[PDB]
Design a protein around this ligand. Structure first.
Ligand code: BDF
Ligand code: BDF
Ligand code: FRU
Ligand code: FRU
Ligand code: BGC
Ligand code: BGC
Ligand code: CA
Ligand code: CA
Ligand code: MG
Ligand code: MG
Ligand code: MG
Ligand code: MG
Ligand code: MG
Lengths: 570, 570
């Protein structure tokens, strides 16, 4: 029978979404800092790679305490990265190449250098209640020793409460001292968030990543006899009272009221899209939470609609080099089992907040992991460098600039916390500073392996991570990946299959030996696979090349080996 | 295309396995205690129910501290239950009726009234090292102040170490003070377990349940400078030093050496089956552990073969009335994802150690839960009472006899620990004591609801839990249930499907609304379902009767409603 026709999906339902970390992508001006003119000079890379949409880590005005996540002006561009004119040029050139562009910001908090905070601290009319301000806890026993409002612990270590001498109250910071939590029960705060989003959509952004949403709302002291309630204690002996893990965040994380804010954002965005037309503008939410709390970002049982999707961190939080094939299958099944009917799945293997994909897994698993990302239903998310298999770079204590590591760590522990190894500059080629900069003095050190692992090398060599990346993003154009069913099971502790199938269309099969040992499997166990089948993609050290035919039902896979097979339609 | 011939499976691969609790099954002699003549009198019940194999909770000589799991003679029958001749009669009549009969015992420990312990405490030759005996922990601060060997906590509260005045040493008890842990590094103890198994296999037993296996082996002092190492502390404020949960059982539970004992037991059983022929004799292992530690009971990487299966307690540990249809699917997929290839899956919904199935879930979910048990691949495990939807019985503090409750509990807390509510006498009919006994003086109180919930009532009335149970055990003779594939997914937060399919054989489909609300689903989402299809079984509260034709692809299911549909072969 002739192949069935399929209805085209809206762009966000099956895009390849690439995360740029602008500070480390491309330095155009020799200061060792990535910049917007740098990104503009390499927009063609996303077309070459088969990326549909780029998001940037923050580029708004920021003192850079948390490299952009401490925003002092939500309406202008950080000078080290360029100007508003450069951003507008980036949007125009990206759109001309057919790319979508999303911006990133963290609604939860503003820099203490923001006009909001300066004015709030001054109790300026309209701003007095813009942030969470509290009096000290009455000390009737030592009237003279000042007590914080509650025992709340910051994500970045120490008390979540910072005394203001000027205002003679504490302000809340779930993150850095310099990152002040907005009061999301203040209508003026909610209106300012719509104002920011409308400003950037009007400039032409295609949507937003909205960061750190579990932390929006904290217990209302009206419900606790006018005090901020203590979070319950963990009782874990490895944590002292200034260490993250000392408290259970009952009153400070994943409060149900946060979701009302997200549903209100979605209603705003839906109105905006109705009144402007063109490509749908979207919101993709970030939060690390349990399955229940994460799925609530999609919407709820009462018909609320939230983010276009919450990001799926399962490959970061629940899989690693310790995982066997059964773990891989059981964790892949979690998002697919719990995600609401009609929701769009997404898959995230890395970001600027976690160690790089091949460092969390193994170097010989890069191709298999990128195949899982591209062959699962829904949206593939790629973190800068995954398309060439970048590894964590070495960063000394002396070179560490991550506030999270400076705050929580010391020269012996800092590696437990630092995100800097996943932020080292991108490897374009084997030139000075891996082609990232004409300068040797980069804001973070260039990883030692850049002569071995760089894009130019992988475009010249017959087989490479990047060429496999290109073959996979191209495969996503096939109806079997955009509209096909899925079946996933383990064949052994070492190997699993993923089958995409769709009547009258080619079948595609992943086989992946995720173990450190060779494995032999019976392909007769794989549903919808008739032999002979053809190798479409293989891992760079596979004995099988693309175009190789699989004729035998007995297949030996090397440690880390992955194959994509193209088989006849069902 | 005429139905394919399937190869008949060995009996233990797809049996319906029924756990009898002899003390609460049937009292023949009016002492309010269930007994072997009582079981003999009702063996036809298993044939009527479509049960293939019965296991009895322990019937060996026991002081009854733990109602038979404290065994004082592993080679003879507890007097209250009957004689060795009653047991030989039971085995004879059961085998005549085509039933398999398994015995239960707990290798970990013997009664302190056993000859083993009395001789071991007396340091008789050969017995000295039968149990774990330890010196007090040396006390350099004040020599001769008596300290226990370690901080280890018993499962039934207090220290796992009991001082013997007679022997001037402590003995290990992971369970009650009266349950003494064997030394499983002693070859004479291992030889004694082979002797015990050989004795009962020689009498005609079809196999064993071996209880409490995670506790067999504890840390060897020879690996900790000649002391028993402390278990790590949990840090949890709700647990004092005498309370289960105070410690993390690093050195006392799930030691990798316990699995070598299991593999040796299978090698012995394999040799016995080979030398005796007839029907395979089996071992089913018990242990509550994580999925890692649970699957090693089947066997290991190196090719060790263990129990025919370990019991799957997921419907007790990981699902309850709090669970939605997505939880059901995600937990059902756990065993099927993790079990080794060739493994036989099994499904346990209750036992004498946990609250009854309708009490853990809801009264209106009984049929749906019995359908899952019978329609998933592998072995269905039934606990005495589940075939009629028995609810937990009320048992006051005054009537409580469970050592776990007496030791861990007080008049206000005892309900958190007691297993007595799941051990109340079986509801045969609406006669005195529900037909369990001619006496009103029963060893536990008969539940208040026996007039409403009894077997005789359910065999008379047109629709019942028992008639559904019978319809389900009959359905397991169909090739689709013994050899069929499975597919399982959630349609909503409320409803899931399970499809058993097998080309040329009929398709069977469970649809189950596990929620408290009506749900409407689209049957066109269910694979291998062509309409019309026939209701084969329905929940007793369903508007649909068996024989009812589903024609519409839109289906509204009431809270708790489950249907089994019979549909055309694929
Ligand atoms: O608009 C609904 C609501 O729940 O949204 C989150 C907070 O702004 C709450 O004060 C507010 O009532
Ligand atoms: O037979 C192997 C072994 O591991 O079995 C379990 C224990 O009896 C151990 O002492 C013994 O070495
Ligand atoms: O460590 C960085 C922290 O900030 C976040 O982005 C907050 O959502 C998370 O990655 C983590 O809690
Ligand atoms: O509550 C009883 C205890 O004994 C066991 O049967 C041992 O495996 C478990 O049910 C529990 O740990
Ligand atoms: C989300 O927000 C936190 C706090 O501002 C930042 O540190 C992360 O990098 C960002 O992804
Ligand atoms: C398994 O073993 C324990 C300890 O003897 C007992 O209490 C349980 O009832 C049994 O299943
Ligand atoms: Ca907040
Ligand atoms: Ca033991
Ligand atoms: Mg620059
Ligand atoms: Mg971290
Ligand atoms: Mg009796
Ligand atoms: Mg219990
Ligand atoms: Mg299928």
């Amino acid at each position: 029978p002739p192949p069935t026709e399929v209805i085209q999906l809206d762009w966000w339902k099956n895009c390849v979404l690439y995360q740029i970390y602008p500070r480390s992508f491309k330095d155009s001006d020799g200061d060792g800092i990535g910049d917007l003119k740098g990104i503009i000079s390499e927009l063609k890379h996303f077309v070459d790679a088969g990326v549909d949409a780029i998001w940037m880590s923050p580029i708004f005005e920021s003192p850079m305490v948390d490299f952009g996540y401490d925003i002092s002006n939500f309406y202008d561009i950080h000078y080290e990265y360029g100007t508003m004119e450069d951003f507008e040029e980036l949007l125009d050139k990206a759109h001309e190449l057919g790319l979508k562009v999303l911006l990133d910001f963290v609604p939860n908090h503003a820099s203490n250098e923001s006009e909001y905070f300066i004015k709030s601290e001054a109790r300026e009319p309209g701003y007095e209640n813009f942030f969470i301000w509290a009096d000290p806890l009455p000390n009737p026993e030592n009237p003279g020793v000042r007590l914080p409002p509650s025992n709340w612990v910051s994500q970045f270590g120490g008390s979540a409460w910072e005394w203001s001498e000027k205002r003679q109250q504490y302000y809340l910071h779930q993150f850095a001292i310099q990152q002040v939590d907005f009061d999301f029960r203040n209508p003026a705060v909610k209106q300012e968030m719509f104002n920011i989003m409308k400003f950037w959509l009007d400039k032409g952004a295609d949507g937003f990543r909205l960061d750190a949403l579990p932390y929006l709302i904290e217990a209302d002291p009206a419900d606790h006899e006018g005090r901020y309630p203590d979070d319950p204690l963990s009782g874990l002996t490895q944590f002292e009272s200034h260490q993250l893990g000392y408290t259970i965040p009952l009153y400070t994380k994943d409060l149900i009221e946060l979701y009302d804010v997200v549903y209100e954002w979605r209603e705003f965005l839906d109105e905006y899209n109705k009144n402007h037309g063109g490509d749908t503008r979207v919101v993709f939410s970030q939060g690390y939470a349990n399955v229940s709390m994460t799925m609530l970002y999609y919407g709820n049982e009462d018909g609320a609609i939230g983010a276009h999707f919450p990001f799926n961190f399962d490959f970061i939080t629940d899989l690693s080099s310790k995982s066997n094939a059964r773990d891989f299958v059981y964790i892949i099944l979690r998002w697919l089992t719990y995600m609401p009917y009609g929701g769009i799945p997404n898959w995230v293997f890395g970001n600027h907040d976690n160690n790089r994909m091949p460092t969390r897994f193994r170097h010989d698993m890069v191709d298999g992991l990128n195949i899982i990302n591209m062959l699962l239903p829904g949206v593939a998310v790629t973190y800068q460098g995954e398309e060439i298999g970048m590894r964590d770079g070495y960063v000394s204590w002396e070179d560490t600039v991550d506030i999270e590591a400076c705050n929580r760590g010391d020269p012996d522990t800092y590696h437990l916390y630092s995100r800097d190894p996943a932020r080292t500059p991108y490897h374009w080629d084997n030139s000075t500073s891996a082609g990232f900069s004409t300068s040797t003095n980069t804001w973070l050190p260039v990883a030692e392996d850049y002569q071995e692992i760089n894009l130019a090398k992988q475009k010249e060599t017959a087989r490479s991570h990047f060429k496999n990346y290109q073959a996979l993003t191209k495969l996503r154009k096939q109806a079997t990946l955009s509209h096909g069913e899925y079946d996933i099971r383990a064949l052994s502790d070492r190997t699993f299959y993923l089958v995409r199938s769709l009547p009258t269309h080619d079948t595609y099969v992943l086989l992946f030996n995720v173990s450190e040992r060779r494995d032999t499997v019976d392909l007769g166990r794989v549903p919808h696979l008739t032999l002979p089948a053809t190798v479409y993609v293989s891992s760079i050290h596979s004995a099988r090349l693309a175009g190789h035919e699989i004729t035998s039902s007995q297949l030996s896979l090397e440690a880390g080996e992955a194959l994509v097979l193209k088989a006849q339609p069902i």
